[PDB]
């Protein structure tokens, strides 16, 4: 009836304006957002590559694009806007084609046929560059890191990104160097200068104070065992009413456990990652400091991150109560190192261990987590764009520029298909010229100088090249050092193709109660 069209149109409408409000992208454009929310909360947001995820939008297709916003970010970690900027590039043709006498089905494979042929041509404009090459790692990181937070610490992060990948590199043009593999940990203190690539596994735990092991000879943590003591796991019929008998219970409780922690150090353990559960109290604060009397690094309520990576790398499992002693399921550890640089931060560094030929653990530091996250998300996306170049070995035009190259050439395949969807392709083959002119959107006065040129700038450059969108000046879009592996752009097209093709099948009115 009318129910399918309107909301499907609204799916094309409400999501488009969101996707239309998107493109300010690539650097100094528009004005900052200090955002009174829909609830009134005031929030400052910049560099909308992250703001995509941060953006809170309702409506079925509009919230779909934030969920589609991670789609580029989830696997790749480079050019996160690439799918969201084209999220409305398909919605361009959507209206027309529904209005053209073309069926949502004929529009459905239209996205496919445009997706199919699109990622095809992108391979031609993908310049394959060595998967393990320090440069194609470093420069992929650099170019990203240039766009990512730190452009100076890039020179630190880019090789650390390289060194983190080249450690875990499984050299291929297929999936390698996963994100579960590389362990990116944060440490208060140090510097991004002192952000340290660490080949070995570094667990980030809360370590009690100091006077504990920075030194060698440690049996690794990740222990779930409580320490059985009177007034812990053991029966005490001493009754507590009077204060003295209420005093008699804690003293046998406190005096006994210090032998238990000796048995824990007897295991060779200088480190315990203690289960965030509690068997009763699990390890009490009596037990925990007694552990700290034995120089055993101990965190009650340990993060899930150092639980799995210690299983992934050191190969560690819980060990039993230390009266029962252990099965030695704790993996092999040798150096248990808490770095104190000006004492800031508690960082468990295991140098040498069981390792799965993988999991570089890179300690990301700085004066504050903000300084840390300057490196971390940067080194991550540097790892990512490297991972992307490990995923797909190539560098293409960055920042949405090649889609305009793909624009003209998909208009040729609009003729080669010669189908009903060839028109659909045609409508969208001209809908990929939108981004570069639209990226310029939001800043200022006397607008139009940017628009049809960025269209023509590749068009005038035949099927070869146009101005870079992130750099500028007439050149090859592809070879800039604004460069991303072919993955990022073929990802974006694949991602927006489906969710927007769902709109075509979005129909009537149906709502879960």
């Amino acid at each position: 009836r009318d129910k399918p069209a309107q909301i499907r149109f609204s799916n094309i409408s409400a999501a488009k304006a969101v996707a239309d409000a998107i493109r300010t992208s690539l650097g100094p454009k528009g004005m900052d957002k200090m955002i009174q929310d829909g609830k009134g909360d005031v929030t400052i947001t910049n560099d909308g590559a992250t703001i995509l995820k941060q953006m809170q939008v309702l409506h079925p297709a509009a919230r779909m694009l934030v969920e589609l916003s991670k789609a580029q970010d989830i696997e790749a970690g480079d050019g996160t806007t690439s799918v969201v900027i084209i999220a409305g590039s398909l919605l361009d043709s959507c209206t027309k084609l529904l209005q053209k006498g073309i069926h949502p089905t004929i529009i459905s494979e239209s996205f496919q046929k445009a997706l199919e042929k699109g990622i095809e041509i992108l391979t031609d404009m993908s310049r394959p560059v060595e998967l393990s090459d320090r440069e194609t790692l470093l420069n992929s990181a650099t170019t990203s890191l240039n766009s990512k937070v730190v452009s100076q610490y890039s020179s630190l992060l880019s090789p650390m990104s390289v060194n983190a990948v080249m450690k875990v590199i499984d050299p291929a043009t297929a999936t390698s160097v996963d994100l579960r593999d590389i362990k990116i940990v944060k440490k208060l203190g140090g510097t991004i200068d002192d952000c340290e690539l660490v080949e070995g596994l570094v667990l980030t735990q809360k370590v009690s104070n100091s006077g504990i092991t920075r030194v060698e000879k440690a049996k690794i943590g990740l222990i779930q065992f409580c320490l059985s003591a009177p007034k812990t796991d053991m029966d005490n019929q001493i009754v507590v009413s009077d204060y003295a008998q209420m005093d008699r219970v804690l003293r046998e409780e406190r005096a006994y456990i210090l032998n238990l922690v000796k048995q824990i150090k007897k295991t060779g353990c200088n480190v315990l990652l203690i289960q965030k559960s509690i068997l009763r109290d699990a390890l009490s604060d009596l037990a925990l400091h007694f552990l700290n009397k034995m120089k055993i690094m101990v965190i009650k309520d340990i993060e899930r991150e150092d639980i799995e990576f210690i299983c992934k790398t050191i190969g560690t499992k819980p060990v039993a109560h230390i009266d029962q002693f252990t099965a030695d399921m704790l993996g092999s550890a040798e150096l248990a190192e808490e770095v104190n640089l000006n004492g800031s931060g508690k960082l468990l560094k295991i140098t040498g261990c069981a390792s799965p030929g993988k999991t570089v653990t890179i300690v990301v530091r700085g004066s504050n987590k903000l300084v840390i996250e300057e490196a971390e998300r940067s080194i991550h996306d540097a790892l990512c764009v490297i991972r992307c170049l490990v995923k797909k070995r190539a560098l293409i035009a960055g920042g949405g520029a090649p889609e305009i190259e793909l624009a003209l050439r998909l208009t040729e395949y609009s003729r080669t298909l010669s189908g009903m969807e060839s028109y659909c392709v045609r409508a969208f083959a001209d809908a990929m010229e939108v981004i570069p002119s639209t990226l310029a959107e939001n800043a200022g006065l006397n607008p139009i100088s940017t628009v049809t040129e960025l269209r023509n700038r590749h068009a005038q450059g035949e099927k070869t090249a146009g101005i870079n969108v992130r750099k500028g000046g007439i050149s090859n879009i592809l070879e800039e050092l604004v460069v991303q592996p072919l993955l990022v752009s073929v990802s974006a097209l694949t991602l927006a193709t489906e969710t927007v093709r769902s709109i075509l099948k979005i129909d009537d009115v149906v709502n879960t109660r």
Binding site: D235, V239, M329, K505
Partner: protein, 508 residues
């Protein structure tokens, strides 16, 4: 209170049930279109739903029209399969057809008994097109390939259609009748390989075994018991309460450790290495179980035990005082394997056999769950398929022949139900129309000439809308056990004739 009258009761009959009839039919038949369920009420999200019941159940039913067809067509899909669309859509089309006959107002007994006779005549006319492909058990295997292959269609899958194309065959073929799952146990996990599904020897389970209990249990004698504890084991002595006051709070937390140690005794009496209990423990008792010698495999699962019970000979029984009352499944090994960042445990000791375990993999369960339903709807038709192998070549080439042939039965046979058996014949071609524009073919020459054409004996050449073309439904395999096309029309036209018989809806 209130009583709704003839028109409105028949109008309200046409408002909700035709609505829910419009929703799923985008998917139904061949696929030129699909249905999407917007979810704003339970969440902020989207649900891609080709599933009739999903669109039936996730939409609450206030309507004596919608309640029925959501109730009816579910049972239709619960029995015959792919029936949530069947009764709903087909009646909705007929509730559209009931309108005019009620609107131009023949007395309802005509509109009642015309389609009544016609639904049969529909089945009858299509009972002529019903033909057994069960000629050979490999041809019946292929009859199980096309019939199930048709049932898996329109229901969103990835490799699950290809996996459960043969596995629906495999299940009913070795069971020899009554497509169901006792012979393949579906244990669905989220795996790395996206579309891939594979056979599970024995069955696998999830846990991280630390402490003294070894990560590996070798030469597994499974002691199958529903007796288990959670934190503690309460029993004759296991019932004790020390607290009348604020004093025993610190003491009462002591004796809970013994109730952890007390149950570990009776299984050591049984002495069997592997003791499977369905209930969790803590770790400190895991430290107690590890030193026991009777291995506690934490939180066993029901289906995998029934898996072992058939091939191994083991049993899950009641009144468990002893191992003897429990037949013992013989398993090769029990191991903690690390699969992803989750650590897993697996049982073995069998190779396929009478039963099987099927373990699906993927990123989400929406791709996994619709597989076993699309399997189930096959199983429903595959329960029909061994009984009646008759494979009627569909897409509307089966359906519109009734529209053609019942028209013959409409013209001469009934006196005033001629218009009715005509009106019933209309819905028989009607989804062929709404699926024709979906794949972009002329509804008319299809639903008009071809129903005449494929009634000439062109029943072979038939309606596949992924395309807009006519194609043989023996070679294209759009067809099923003809019992799938009978009971649906019955409970469809009935559910249309139920509320067609309704001239009063009394609302208390």
């Amino acid at each position: 209170a209130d009583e709704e009258r003839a028109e409105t009761a028949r109008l309200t009959s046409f408002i909700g049930a035709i609505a829910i009839g419009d929703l799923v039919k985008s998917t139904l038949g061949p696929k030129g279109m699909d249905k999407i369920l917007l979810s704003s009420g339970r969440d902020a999200s989207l649900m891609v739903t080709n599933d009739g019941a999903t669109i039936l159940k996730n939409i609450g039913v206030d309507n004596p029209a919608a309640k029925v067809l959501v109730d009816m067509s579910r049972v239709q899909d619960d029995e015959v399969g792919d029936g949530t669309t069947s009764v709903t859509v087909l009646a909705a089309e007929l509730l559209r057809e009931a309108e005019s006959l009620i609107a131009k107002k023949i007395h309802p007994q005509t509109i009642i008994a015309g389609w009544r006779e016609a639904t049969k005549a529909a089945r009858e006319a299509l009972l002529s097109s019903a033909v057994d492909h069960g000629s050979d058990e490999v041809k019946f295997r292929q009859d199980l390939m096309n019939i199930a292959g048709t049932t898996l269609s329109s229901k969103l899958l990835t490799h699950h259609k290809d996996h459960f194309t043969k596995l629906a065959v495999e299940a009913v073929l070795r069971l020899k009748g009554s497509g169901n799952l006792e012979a393949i146990h579906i244990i669905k996990k989220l795996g790395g390989s996206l579309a891939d599904s594979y056979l599970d020897e024995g069955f696998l389970l999830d846990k991280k075994i630390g402490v003294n209990q070894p990560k590996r249990i070798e030469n597994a004698k499974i002691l199958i018991a529903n007796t288990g504890m959670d934190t503690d084991k309460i029993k004759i002595f296991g019932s004790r309460v020390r607290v009348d006051s604020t004093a025993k709070v610190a003491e009462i937390e002591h004796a809970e450790k013994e109730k952890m140690k007390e149950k570990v005794e009776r299984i050591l009496k049984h002495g069997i290495n592997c003791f499977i209990n369905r209930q969790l423990i803590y770790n400190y008792p895991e430290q107690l179980f590890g030193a026991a010698g009777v291995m506690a495999i934490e939180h066993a699962d029901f289906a995998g035990v029934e898996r072992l019970a058939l091939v191994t000979g083991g049993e899950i029984a009641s009144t468990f005082d002893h191992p003897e009352l429990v037949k013992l499944g013989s398993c090769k090994l029990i191991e903690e394997v690390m699969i992803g960042e989750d650590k897993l445990i697996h049982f073995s000791g069998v190779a396929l056999g009478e039963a099987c375990t099927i373990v699906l993999r993927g990123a989400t369960q929406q791709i996994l769950d619709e597989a076993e339903r699309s399997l189930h709807d096959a199983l429903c038709v595959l329960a029909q398929t061994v009984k009646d192998s008759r494979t009627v070549y569909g897409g509307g080439c089966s359906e519109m022949l009734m529209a053609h042939a019942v028209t013959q039965l409409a013209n001469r046979t009934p006196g005033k139900e001629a218009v009715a058996m005509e009106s019933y014949a209309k819905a028989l071609r009607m989804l062929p129309t709404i699926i024709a524009d979906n794949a972009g073919y002329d509804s008319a020459d299809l639903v008009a000439q071809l129903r005449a054409a494929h009634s000439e004996g062109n029943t072979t050449a038939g309606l596949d809308m992924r395309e807009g073309t006519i194609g043989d439904m023996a070679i294209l395999g759009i067809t099923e056990s003809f019992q799938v096309k009978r009971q649906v029309l019955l409970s469809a036209a009935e559910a249309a004739e139920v509320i067609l018989r309704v001239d009063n809806i009394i609302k208390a």
